[PDB]
């Protein structure tokens, strides 16, 4: 052994893995953002109906803290219809509005009657 570098760097020491003797939390907190706390209600707007007839998209009032990914799979689970693209915004009053464009092999009207809105 000799010194080649004229400097002294600290050697790498064996840093173990965290192995606690007891979990700090006894219970894993359940996800409060499940599928039903993520879609509050659809829209019954004279514009949203125009959005349903023409563009084949549904309009929901989703929670303020949902990704487009999460909204896509939520609808995909609650109404069994595949989603082509989601567009979201935040209304001035505060709640987040979502335009769920359905897949073209699906119909927005006959699924709007599946959930009552017309």
């Amino acid at each position: 052994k000799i010194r080649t570098s004229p400097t002294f760097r600290r050697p790498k020491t064996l840093r173990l893995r965290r192995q606690p003797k007891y979990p700090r939390k006894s219970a894993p907190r359940r996800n409060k953002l499940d599928h039903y706390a993520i879609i509050k209600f659809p829209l019954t707007t004279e514009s949203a109906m125009k959005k349903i007839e023409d563009n084949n998209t549904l309009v929901f009032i989703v929670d303020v803290k949902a990704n487009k990914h999460q909204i896509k799979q939520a609808v995909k689970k609650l109404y069994d219809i595949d989603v082509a693209k989601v567009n979201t915004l935040i209304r001035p009053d505060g709640e987040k509005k979502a335009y769920v464009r359905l897949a073209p092999d699906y119909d927005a009207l006959d699924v709007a009657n599946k959930i009552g809105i017309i």
Partner: protein, 233 residues
């Protein structure tokens, strides 16, 4: 026989000719702060005039006799933690159906049996950090006529008694077969530590200049001795 493509290509390590190889640099390393301090505090023990009470631990016991000292003491180790409970089950049957001499560790127990002059040989360790814990001792074993010596290493001293370290170890009593085995150690030690006292009280360690300076005085001490050596002839 040999492939004539094998050609020796030297690298001319001149000034600015080729790049220097990875030569050893263990002399110019910017050491950490704790190592840098760890050494230049040892230079201070070879620079400043060390007073005789602290210098007297640089002089130590020689090796070949120290192997006898520990081996003699290796039977006089006190009973371990494991032998202690085994020495309390023997008493546990003698009710249900003398202690030999041992070593003495710890300064606060050794001095209490040096003032009573019970020891035969008090061994110390040269490398105790707050040296104040010892420095009185060699001047006091000499006073009350107890043969002392200085062994290099409180660690190997703290190996007899199973601890991390120990400062002093005393021989209160011994067995009869090792009685004369001790006597040959006492005389060889007393003739170097106890009777050699007045020389030790006036031995100031240190006052040494560095090898980069004693070579600098000498280069002017040989040059000055070059002039007056051919002036008369």
């Amino acid at each position: 026989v040999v492939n004539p493509l094998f050609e020796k290509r030297p690298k001319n390590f001149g000034i600015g000719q080729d790049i220097q190889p990875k030569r050893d640099l263990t002399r110019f390393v910017k050491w950490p702060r704790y190592i840098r301090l760890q050494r230049q505090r040892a230079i201070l023990y070879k620079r400043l005039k060390v007073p005789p009470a602290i210098n007297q631990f640089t002089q130590v016991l020689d090796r070949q006799t120290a192997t006898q000292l520990l081996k003699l003491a290796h039977k006089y180790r006190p009973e371990t933690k494991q032998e202690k409970k085994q020495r309390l089950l023997a008493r546990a049957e003698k009710k249900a159906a003398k202690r030999p001499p041992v070593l003495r560790a710890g300064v606060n127990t050794v001095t209490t049996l040096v003032e009573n002059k019970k020891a035969q040989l008090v061994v110390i360790a040269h490398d105790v950090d707050p040296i104040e814990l010892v420095v009185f001792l060699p001047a006091l074993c000499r006073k009350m006529g107890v043969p002392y010596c200085i062994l290099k290493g409180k660690a190997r001293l703290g190996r007899l008694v199973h601890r991390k370290t120990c400062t002093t170890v005393a021989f209160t009593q011994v067995n009869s077969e090792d009685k004369g085995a001790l006597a040959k150690l006492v005389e060889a030690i007393r003739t170097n530590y106890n009777d050699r006292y007045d020389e030790i009280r006036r031995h100031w360690g240190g006052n040494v200049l560095g090898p980069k300076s004693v070579a600098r005085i000498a280069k002017l001490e040989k040059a000055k001795a070059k002039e007056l050596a051919t002036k008369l002839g």
